Amino acid sequence: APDREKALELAMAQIDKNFGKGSVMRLGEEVRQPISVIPTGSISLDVALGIGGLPRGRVIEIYGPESSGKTTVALHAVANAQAAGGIAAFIDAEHALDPEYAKKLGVDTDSLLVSQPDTGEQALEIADMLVRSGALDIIVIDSVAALVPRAEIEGLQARLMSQALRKMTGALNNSGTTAIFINQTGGKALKFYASVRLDVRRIETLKDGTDAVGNRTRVKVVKNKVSPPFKQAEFDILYGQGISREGSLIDMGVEHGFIRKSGSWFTYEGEQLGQGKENARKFLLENTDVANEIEKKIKEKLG
Numbered sequence: 001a002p003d004r005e006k007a008l009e010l011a012m013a014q015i016d017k018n019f020g021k022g023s024v025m026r027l028g029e030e031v032r033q034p035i036s037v038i039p040t041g042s043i044s045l046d047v048a049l050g051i052g053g054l055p056r057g058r059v060i061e062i063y064g065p066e067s068s069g070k071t072t073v074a075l076h077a078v079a080n081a082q083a084a085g086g087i088a089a090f091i092d093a094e095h096a097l098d099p100e101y102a103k104k105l106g107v108d109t110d111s112l113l114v115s116q117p118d119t120g121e122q123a124l125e126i127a128d129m130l131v132r133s134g135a136l137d138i139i140v141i142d143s144v145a146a147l148v149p150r151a152e153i154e155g156l157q158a159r160l161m162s163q164a165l166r167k168m169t170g171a172l173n174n175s176g177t178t179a180i181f182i183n184q185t186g187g188k189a190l191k192f193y194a195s196v197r198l199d200v201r202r203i204e205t206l207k208d209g210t211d212a213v214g215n216r217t218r219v220k221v222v223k224n225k226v227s228p229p230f231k232q233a234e235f236d237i238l239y240g241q242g243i244s245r246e247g248s249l250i251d252m253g254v255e256h257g258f259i260r261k262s263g264s265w266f267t268y269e270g271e272q273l274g275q276g277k278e279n280a281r282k283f284l285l286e287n288t289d290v291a292n293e294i295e296k297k298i299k300e301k302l303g
């Protein structure tokens with residue numbers, strides 16, 4: 001009975017040694033637990049990431065059809081690792097950032113390092129030597145696609161990446177700076193260097209009695225080298241306001257039973273919150289105490 005597995009692990013064990021950590025996993029393991037991670041503003045996605053947030057030191061890829069949430073998740077990423085001392089750098093190539101928004105989310109823009117490169121090449125160096133300073137915690141490159149090499153501006157892209165990614169995946173691992181890339185093209189590279197790959201797509205248009213409060217987004221963790229992959233999460237994005245914390249709690253809060261649905265009436269053990277997800281949201285919105293409790297308990301029911 002044991003000889004079988006008693007060898008799988010001897011093997012499986014040397015596999016890690018020779019190649020890494022998450023080289024060979026059990027989609028069922030609760031395994032590991034690092035003390036470095038950046039929340040993403042979605043408890044739903046954090047437990048989905050398996051480590052409660054984006055691993056620091058790794059390269060992260062977040063792709064999906066336009067207007068489905070990538071950058072929103074990224075700005076929060078920033079918001080967090082920034083509220084926690086470290087600073088973030090944003091290498092712009094799309095030229096479509098809205099600070100008033102990045103701000104609401106929680107970014108301290110006035111102290112955010114933005115760079116508007118000219119070549120896709122110049123961009124990866126500014127991003128390279130910048131990460132080497134060992135100062136940035138998180139850096140985000142907006143659009144793996146908008147990174148044209150000098151030639152085209154004056155095949156070579158997926159090389160530009162290949163090149164840059166090797167020379168850059170290195171430092172990152174020393175530096176400890178986690179890096180984010182937004183996609184929709186030069187793939188291959190990133191599709192491998194990535195330690196984590198999030199697939200973000202929009203599932204519904206959040207109706208709010210009126211016409212719309214936001215969008216229900218779904219993320220699928222297609223690649224996870226820091227824990228088991230394939231787990232997925234969904235959350236809401238309120239038009240110009242961001243990933244609804246609270247709303248993320250109702251859902252997580254009932255899919256774990258700390259919140260009961262007695263027929264559209266969300267109740268938190270005994271006492272009611274409201275009637276209609278958006279109403280209970282409201283309750284949670286203006287009730288931080290109770291809120292933090294669910295989060296707290298939700299957070300203790302998992303890790």
Ligand SMILES: Nc1ncnc2c1ncn2[C@@H]1O[C@H](COP(=O)(O)OP(=O)(O)O)[C@@H](O)[C@H]1O
Nearest residue numbers: 066067068069070071072073098101214239240
């Ligand atoms: N400045 C803004 N004002 C209002 N809503 C915004 C703003 N920026 C982003 N959003 C919301 O984010 C959604 C798309 O996410 P981002 O805008 O994250 O796109 P990606 O999904 O990054 O293209 C939009 O449909 C919208 O609901």
